[PDB]
């Protein structure tokens, strides 16, 4: 096949004859055509609207391997790509039997009109409805059922291979793995309810190792407008969390932390928690405490944005809802500005936050501790990424001390 597909030009002929024949000759015609005859899914009304004759002779080609080696992942994948290319090349270009049923069921110009609306571009139900009752003036959708699945079979085809093809990887590079994930997510999101069949059962037997590098995607794609699609996805990601729980740890807590974005979180982090409790308790207050440890630089910030806005109600308001907001090191800042409320109340009636900016710029210019800003230890918290580690680190201990770094928003 590949040799073929190098000497494409001078071997299109060949090819054509074949089909013609295949349909009713060179030592290589003949040859091909007794290789592609072999007695042991695709067909030749489907691949007649789209899809050229020479190249059908790959995908035969492509099917045979991998009927006649279901062991081996290349075929499948191959066959996979093939399919998928032609699918979403004939699936963008179209942007008897059926003629016999029609016309049975509506016992010139009408039927003409009403054959052309069947498939003019195929809330797809309610404009089709609209457009045969404003043309013709009901078997018209079983009809457009039946065709538009006839059109919309190579993605079928691709699905299955795909999915066939990552169950023999649970043999191949994880380039060639990557690829496959991302056109299967790619047409579960675009096209869904048209094979809605196929993935509700590719999803629920699908192994979580090859699916592991897609995780971002997943999450990101949490708020399909669909019922089915998200409830899929939660179900992946929670099946995922087994056996593998430090790869959607951090991203569901962070979330948790539109009502479409929250059921979500809250299954995946309940189905999370139904293993190692402690664990999820305990990371949960480490990133609380995290959020908590990003006082005197927000009021340096306040007073300096203020200074510079200055040259009224709004400055009163940002100034007391920074107070209401800042009410082992709070408390000891608070003793020593504790001066900040009543000096703003009594210039409310300005120097007061001039000098209050003016001695925090002074008093910033470094090394930090973690006891005064809480410490644990022989914890079961994975490390903050652990893509490539086959056995989990957790965490056993923390700085004693945090330092600064300068020429910086402010990095710690």
Known sequence: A???????????????????????????????????????????????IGVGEPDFILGQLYHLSSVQAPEVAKSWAALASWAYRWGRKVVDNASXXXXXXXXXXXXXXXXXXXXXXXXXXXXXXXXXXXXXXXXXXEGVIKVWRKVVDRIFSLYKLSCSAYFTFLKLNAQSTDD?????????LRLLVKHAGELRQYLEHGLETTPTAPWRGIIPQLFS?????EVYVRQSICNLLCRVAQDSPHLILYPAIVGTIQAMMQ???????????????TMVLQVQMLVAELRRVTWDELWLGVLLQQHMYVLXXXXXXXXXXXXXXXXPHEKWFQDNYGDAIENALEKLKXXXXXXXXXXXXXXXXYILRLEE????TNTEIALPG???????VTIHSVGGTITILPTKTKPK
């Open 2 to 48: 590949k040799w073929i597909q190098a000497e494409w030009k001078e071997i299109s002929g060949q090819l054509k004859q074949v089909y013609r024949a295949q349909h009713q000759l060179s030592t290589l015609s003949k040859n091909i055509l007794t290789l592609i005859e072999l007695p042991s899914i695709e067909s030749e009304s489907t691949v007649h």
């Open 176 to 184: 060639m793995i990557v690829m496959a994930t991302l056109r299967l």
């Open 221 to 225: 794609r949490l708020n399909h407008p």
């Open 263 to 277: 059921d979500c979180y809250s299954k995946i982090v309940d189905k999370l928690s139904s293993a190692n409790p």
């Open 373 to 376: 800003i809480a410490a644990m």
């Open 386 to 392: 652990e893509v490539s580690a086959r056995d989990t």
